[PDB]
Amino acid sequence: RCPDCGSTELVEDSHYSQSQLVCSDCGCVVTEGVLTTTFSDEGNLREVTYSRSTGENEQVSRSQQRGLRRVRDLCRVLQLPPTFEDTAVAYYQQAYRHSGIRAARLQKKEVLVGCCVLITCRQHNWPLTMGAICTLLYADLDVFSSTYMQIVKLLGLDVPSLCLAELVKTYCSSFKLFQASPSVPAKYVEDKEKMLSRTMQLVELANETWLVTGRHPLPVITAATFLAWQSLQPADRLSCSLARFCKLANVDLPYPASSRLQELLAVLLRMAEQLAWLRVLRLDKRSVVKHIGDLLQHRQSLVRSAFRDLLLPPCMLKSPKRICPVPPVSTVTGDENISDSEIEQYLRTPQEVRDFQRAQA
Amino acid sequence: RAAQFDVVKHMRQDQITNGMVNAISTGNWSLKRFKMDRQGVTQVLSRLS
Amino acid sequence: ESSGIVPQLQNIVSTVNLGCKLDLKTIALRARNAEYNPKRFAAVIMRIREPRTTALIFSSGKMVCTGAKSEEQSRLAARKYARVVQKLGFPAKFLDFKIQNMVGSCDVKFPIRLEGLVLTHQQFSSYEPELFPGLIYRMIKPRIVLLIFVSGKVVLTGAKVRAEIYEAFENIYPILKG
Amino acid sequence: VMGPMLDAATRKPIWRHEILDADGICSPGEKVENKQVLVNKSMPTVTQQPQYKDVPITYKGATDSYIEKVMISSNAEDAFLIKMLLRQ
Amino acid sequence: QPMIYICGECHTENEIKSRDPIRCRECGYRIMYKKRTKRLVVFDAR
Amino acid sequence: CVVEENDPIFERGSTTTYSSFRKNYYSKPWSNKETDMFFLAISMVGTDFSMIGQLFPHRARIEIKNKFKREEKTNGWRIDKAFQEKRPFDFDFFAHLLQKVLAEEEKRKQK
Amino acid sequence: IVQDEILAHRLGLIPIHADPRLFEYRNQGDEEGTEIDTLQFRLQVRCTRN
Amino acid sequence: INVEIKKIMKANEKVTSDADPMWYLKYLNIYVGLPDVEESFNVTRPVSPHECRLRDMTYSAPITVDIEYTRGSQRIIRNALPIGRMPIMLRSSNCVLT
Ligand SMILES: Nc1nc2c(ncn2[C@@H]2O[C@H](COP(=O)(O)OP(=O)(O)OP(=O)(O)O)[C@@H](O)[C@H]2O)c(=O)[nH]1
Ligand SMILES: [Zn+2]
Ligand SMILES: [Zn+2]
Numbered sequence: 017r018c019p020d021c022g023s024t025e026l027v028e029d030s031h032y033s034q035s036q037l038v039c040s041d042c043g044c045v046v047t048e049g050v051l052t053t054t055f056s057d058e059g060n061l062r063e064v065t066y067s068r069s070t071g072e073n074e075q076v077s078r079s080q081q082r083g084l085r086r087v088r089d090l091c092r093v094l095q096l097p098p099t100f101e102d103t104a105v106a107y108y109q110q111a112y113r114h115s116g117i118r119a120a121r122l123q124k125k126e127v128l129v130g131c132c133v134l135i136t137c138r139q140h141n142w143p144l145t146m147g148a149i150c151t152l153l154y155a156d157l158d159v160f161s162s163t164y165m166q167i168v169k170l171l172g173l174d175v176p177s178l179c180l181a182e183l184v185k186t187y188c189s190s191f192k193l194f195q196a197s198p199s200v201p202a203k204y205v206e207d208k209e210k211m212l213s214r215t216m217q218l219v220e221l222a223n224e225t226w227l228v229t230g231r232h233p234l235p236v237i238t239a240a241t242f243l244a245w246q247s248l249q250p251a252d253r254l255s256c257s258l259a260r261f262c263k264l265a266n267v268d269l270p271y272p273a274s275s276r277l278q279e280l281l282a283v284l285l286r287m288a289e290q291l292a293w294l295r296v297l298r299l300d301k302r303s304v305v306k307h308i309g310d311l312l313q314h315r316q317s318l319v320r321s322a323f324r325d326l327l328l329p330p331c332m333l334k335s336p337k338r339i340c341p342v343p344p345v346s347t348v349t350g351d352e353n354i355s356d357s358e359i360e361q362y363l364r365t366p367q368e369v370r371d372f373q374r375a376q377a
Numbered sequence: 378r379a380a381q382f383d384v385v386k387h388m389r390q391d392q393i394t395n396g397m398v399n400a401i402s403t404g405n406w407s408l409k410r411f412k413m414d415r416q417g418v419t420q421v422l423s424r425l426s
Numbered sequence: 427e428s429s430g431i432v433p434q435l436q437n438i439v440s441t442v443n444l445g446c447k448l449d450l451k452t453i454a455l456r457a458r459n460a461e462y463n464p465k466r467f468a469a470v471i472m473r474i475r476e477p478r479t480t481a482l483i484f485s486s487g488k489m490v491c492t493g494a495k496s497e498e499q500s501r502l503a504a505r506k507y508a509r510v511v512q513k514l515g516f517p518a519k520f521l522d523f524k525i526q527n528m529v530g531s532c533d534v535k536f537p538i539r540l541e542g543l544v545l546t547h548q549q550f551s552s553y554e555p556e557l558f559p560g561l562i563y564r565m566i567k568p569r570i571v572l573l574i575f576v577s578g579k580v581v582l583t584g585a586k587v588r589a590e591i592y593e594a595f596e597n598i599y600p601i602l603k604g
Numbered sequence: 605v606m607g608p609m610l611d612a613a614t615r616k617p618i619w620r621h622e623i624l625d626a627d628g629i630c631s632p633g634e635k636v637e638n639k640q641v642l643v644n645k646s647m648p649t650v651t652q653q654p655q656y657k658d659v660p661i662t663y664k665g666a667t668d669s670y671i672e673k674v675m676i677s678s679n680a681e682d683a684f685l686i687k688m689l690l691r692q
Numbered sequence: 693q694p695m696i697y698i699c700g701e702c703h704t705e706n707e708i709k710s711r712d713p714i715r716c717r718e719c720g721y722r723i724m725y726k727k728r729t730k731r732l733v734v735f736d737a738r
Numbered sequence: 739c740v741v742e743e744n745d746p747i748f749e750r751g752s753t754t755t756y757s758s759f760r761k762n763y764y765s766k767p768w769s770n771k772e773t774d775m776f777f778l779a780i781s782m783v784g785t786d787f788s789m790i791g792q793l794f795p796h797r798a799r800i801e802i803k804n805k806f807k808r809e810e811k812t813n814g815w816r817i818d819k820a821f822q823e824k825r826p827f828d829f830d831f832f833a834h835l836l837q838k839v840l841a842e843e844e845k846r847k848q849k
Numbered sequence: 850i851v852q853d854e855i856l857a858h859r860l861g862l863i864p865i866h867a868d869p870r871l872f873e874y875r876n877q878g879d880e881e882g883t884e885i886d887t888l889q890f891r892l893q894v895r896c897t898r899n
Numbered sequence: 900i901n902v903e904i905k906k907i908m909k910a911n912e913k914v915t916s917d918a919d920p921m922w923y924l925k926y927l928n929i930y931v932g933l934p935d936v937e938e939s940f941n942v943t944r945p946v947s948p949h950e951c952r953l954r955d956m957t958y959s960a961p962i963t964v965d966i967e968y969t970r971g972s973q974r975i976i977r978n979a980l981p982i983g984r985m986p987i988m989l990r991s992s993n994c995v996l997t
Pocket of ligand 2: 019020023040042
């Protein structure tokens, strides 16, 4: 309030390079002048961080220090920004706060570093498959997933879902069919932008047709990019196989990639049957690759009609007449027991006892 | 551990990048292997004309 | 407006103390269906015709009976195991019996968008298709953990009485339907 | 970036936030006077509800300047870089 | 409120909300300019 | 020094790698006569897997446990009949049957 | 691409064939202008491909 | 970037540790590649000097090298591994302006 009139209309108005909080009613100067360091003071002062001024970094054990150093080393090997590095170290410290993770195994803390890196990567909508992390972390997928579930259940942090398009782009950037290298001839080289757009459309179709839900996404991405590479030039790529494409691209062939490719080809054949000219052509899983483009051109109405006339595993679509048969309720309990004949037939005889002893002698 | 160790897991790719960026931005070059401490090597290109 | 579907309990796990020490060596020696290996595990595995029942008897008198389909069947199996232990020559008793957990299964007969479910109930759900195809939902109502599959089949666990599983299913049905 | 603080008395932005657009960023084509904000930036103070404090980029100049272009880019750190080109 | 921007190479009017990845369709350029205001501005011929 | 003892491998593409989750288990299926003699061994011993694995040298105890669990989950009447019936433990005849099974699998491999 | 101020200066440098004897000087201020002492020239040009 | 870098790589081609003999890391050939930007998600994309000036980033190219080491006495080779980023000079041999 103003000391003269008591008004609360105090505005900060700088009058010719002079900061001043003055009232807007009577113009009474409440406060004037501010003290700010100059260039000489700024250059003479040294920067000290809270990690040292507050007092931390001293009550830390060598194990936690090694964990933090490994987190930083992996974050730098992955060429992730310092913001990602900071978020990763922060999440690692937050997880270490707990005792169950504090006093855990060496592999446990390694997988903890891995999962903290993965959570930091997911929080920024960044694509990063867990396979590369498991490979660069010296761990197995089983224990990795077990410790990941344990730590997420213990913490409860937000786990954003892995976007499909980001992973699609990340995996398409890996293939070397963009620049003509000595090994790969020019016929296999295709257009990066067009192939990526085709793969994106294919994986969106797969996500909308219930193909990626419940199954690994990377095999579907591989099948989609393979179908796009074949459709961009079906003539010279009619004989090429999935294993041949993997060998040419220097990529580890996923196992269910074949099943995902077969399912996607079946969906494309259904879309062809929906279309008029294609259903008259009577194409197949080998001649639909040249018309995949026409399918994706208007896949909306095609998928709509296909759903009008759900996608489940093959083991369930085998005419499930008796779904979850009702078992016969048997609550017969008697009074308290049945008899002692069962106890007698359960008890081991002396002959069998001696036989077991002789066998295990 | 019995798990065989390899360099690819510690091949820090940001070391050289940060070193070059700093040497070109700050302009101060401190080579300890040669005991060379130079300053003012890099200067802002004057775009006055 | 009920859901119209009733789950089916496939496992009932309950602990029960006998109140006396036991000699696992003699228990396994004087029995035909006895499975015990002290260097591997310190529990004797007993089996009876209550559906799929397996008792994990210990030396301290504590035994966990699992595989039953109902609380009454689990109690009957526990009492039969206690009677077998008594006939084996030990002063075993049937005290401190209480249902510890019950795992059941159910089906909704229509697909479910796991991505949409997790985007809608993230704070109560977790979806990691790269590890387990089933989305893991954790409801606080009866403290229940549910595995939801794309096919619609849902497996519930972490309850104490059949009513808890029933009301949890009745509450989660409209969320999955919507 | 917060929107222009409209004055309830006149239902128009105040003299300080007059040059700001609907998104709080000054639009090209207008003139900038002394002690006028260009980006109504607000940053959190925690680093339970976040508490944002305003730190707008005020224009220090004796004469007026005209905004020619306002470029907006996004870096790999999800950081938004906004560059305004003032002309005199 | 629909906020419109222009691309650096495509020069197409793109509508995006707040807190979105700065990108332009049918390309991958990450330079987005703001269109000129519609308000009346007075200039002096001196 | 390594005098051309190993060969370089063109693996581990620097781009990225995926997971497997299935490494070593890779069990081997059973047969009709093998299931019959397995039910016989069950009726003869019980449920103690240690002795069953000791008497089955060519099949793992983990595989035996998996088979027993599968039988308990699918065919309960067969396990009930096996527990109803009993046979005194035989060693020489059991070794003879083991040799017969070895000869049978050898003939199968020949086929 | 031409700056607004440069364009305004170039336009101000353009002469007008109007007879000045028929007009008068604008008073102090009055930016709206009056019909007696103001002339309005519109310029609207939209370039497009042929 | 064409001869001196290769000479330095040849001078420092082999590096090994005293402990655990028979272990080494041999570089075969180092490459500089074309100027790229690490903006995209693990994807490279050509970037222009003007775009770099606008976005306040560095105009460098990813330094890649091929190497061979011994993990468990089994020689494992890598044909392309990034190790750094060398700021590319404008109007150079590998620059986009030339
Ligand atoms: N107008 C002006 N020009 C300067 C100034 N300082 C340096 N220059 C110009 O650029 C040069 C030297 O800049 P430096 O003194 O090397 O900058 P610096 O001192 O290295 O910065 P520090 O490393 O912190 O000391 C001279 O050749 C000058 O032509 C300055 O303060 N004003
Ligand atoms: Zn006042
Ligand atoms: Zn564009």
